[PDB]
Amino acid sequence: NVADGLAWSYYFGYLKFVLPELEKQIEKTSKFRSKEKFVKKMFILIPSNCFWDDKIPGSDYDPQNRITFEGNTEPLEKTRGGVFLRHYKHSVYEIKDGENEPWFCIMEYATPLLTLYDMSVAQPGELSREERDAQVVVFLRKLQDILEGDRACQGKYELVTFSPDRDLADVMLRKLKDS
Amino acid sequence: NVADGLAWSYYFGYLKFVLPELEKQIEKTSKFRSKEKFVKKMFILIPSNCFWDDKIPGSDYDPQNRITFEGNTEPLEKTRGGVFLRHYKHSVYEIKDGENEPWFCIMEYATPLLTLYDMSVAQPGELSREERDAQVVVFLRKLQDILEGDRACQGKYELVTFSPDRDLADVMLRKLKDSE
Numbered sequence: 001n002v003a004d005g006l007a008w009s010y011y012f013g014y015l016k017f018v019l020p021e022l023e024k025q026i027e028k029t030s031k032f033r034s035k036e037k038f039v040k041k042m043f044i045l046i047p048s049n050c051f052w053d054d055k056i057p058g059s060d061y062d063p064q065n066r067i068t069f070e071g072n073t074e075p076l077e078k079t080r081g082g083v084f085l086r087h088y089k090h091s092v093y094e095i096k097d098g099e100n101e102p103w104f105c106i107m108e109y110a111t112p113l114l115t116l117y118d119m120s121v122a123q124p125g126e127l128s129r130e131e132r133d134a135q136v137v138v139f140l141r142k143l144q145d146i147l148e149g150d151r152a153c154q155g156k157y158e159l160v161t162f163s164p165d166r167d168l169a170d171v172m173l174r175k176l177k178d179s
Numbered sequence: 180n181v182a183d184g185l186a187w188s189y190y191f192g193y194l195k196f197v198l199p200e201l202e203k204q205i206e207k208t209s210k211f212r213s214k215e216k217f218v219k220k221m222f223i224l225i226p227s228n229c230f231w232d233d234k235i236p237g238s239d240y241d242p243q244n245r246i247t248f249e250g251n252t253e254p255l256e257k258t259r260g261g262v263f264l265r266h267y268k269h270s271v272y273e274i275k276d277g278e279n280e281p282w283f284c285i286m287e288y289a290t291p292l293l294t295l296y297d298m299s300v301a302q303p304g305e306l307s308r309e310e311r312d313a314q315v316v317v318f319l320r321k322l323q324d325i326l327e328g329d330r331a332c333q334g335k336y337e338l339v340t341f342s343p344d345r346d347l348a349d350v351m352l353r354k355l356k357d358s359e
């Protein structure tokens with residue numbers, strides 16, 4: 001129930017209007033446009049623990065330092081909720097693929113998940129650590145259900161679920177190859 | 180409870196770190212500090228319908244067109260969810276009081292409410308308009324409880340509840356004047 005609202009908010013307040021124009025947005029940067037092996041879809045990071053380092057380069061998920069920040073994308077300006085020209089931008093990362101050419105992709109954590117974690121820590125009485133795990137599952141399936149119902153979001157995103165024990169670089173490299 | 184999550188997200192993902200220094204953020208702009216009748220607190224707009232025009236100046240809520248966009252504040256930069264330096268800024272508005280001196284304040288709609296509205300329209304089976312009305316109340320009470328439990332957020336915000344039939348300019352002028 002609570003995860004349901006977070007999934008809808010994640011769509012209506014973000015994904016619905018940032019995914020259809022994600023490809024077009026990236027092309028505005030020469031540094032990004034001239035790039036090969038750059039998948040033009042949002043890789044939504046969904047860790048099972050619901051916690052992450054807001055900074056991915058050299059994060060705990062990236063032990064070998066194969067992931068590197070390539071600068072943000074052109075910020076999308078949109079007026080919403082009385083706030084003029086609110087900024088919607090994404091971070092481009094560089095993933096070393098051994099001796100091969102490095103990979104480039106947009107990586108973002110599912111921000112509603114941070115609410116679930118913070119709730120479990122700040123108010124364990126409303127959301128227990130056990131209850132938190134259940135809502136993550138609901139969130140994923142609900143979000144997937146919503147996005148699958150949006151033709152404009154078709155092939156504009158990739159849900160990357162992984163446990164925090166996994167090497168983010170390894171997990172990412174597989175999905176990057178599978179494209 | 181869906182409204183509970185929306186309230187917590189509105190806090191943890193926004194209000195918790197934008198409210199305590201909201202005043203200081205405003206002072207960074209020369210045009211704003213020297214301004215009189217300028218309350219340095221976020222007036223969170225909470226319409227009962229949960230729907231609004233994203234542009235308040237000359238909006239449907241502002242018939243007499245007394246509200247005017249006076250520019251945004253210096254954006255607060257913070258890296259969140261793998262996104263480097265997300266921008267968190269607010270819009271300053273000017274409210275005309277007839278021939279008298281105008282008022283200045285930050286006005287924002289409660290963005291989680293738009294989710295409640297959109298849910299009621301897209302999937303009425305999951306969230307009916309009757310259930311939506313109940314969830315707005317829960318959201319409001321929850322949001323108040325959360326903010327009241329944070330002294331850093333004390334007296335740095337103002338919840339402005341109103342029906343979409345009322346004149347936003349009037350309601351705001353009332354709230355601003357009653358706070359002396």
Ligand SMILES: Nc1nc(=O)c2ncn([C@@H]3O[C@@H]4COP(=O)(O)O[C@H]5[C@@H](O)[C@H](n6cnc7c(N)ncnc76)O[C@@H]5COP(=O)(O)O[C@@H]3[C@@H]4O)c2[nH]1
Binds near residue numbers: 111268
């Ligand atoms: N008025 C206003 N100005 C803001 O800057 C702002 N930032 C957040 N919020 C509201 O706080 C709550 C929690 O924030 P969160 O990041 O976890 O979820 C966000 C986040 O997952 C995603 N999103 C929205 N804007 C951005 C953005 N600029 N960058 C990345 N992700 C974003 O979409 C969700 C819903 O956004 P909103 O529908 O605008 O309202 C949010 C939300 O209800 C804001 N409200």
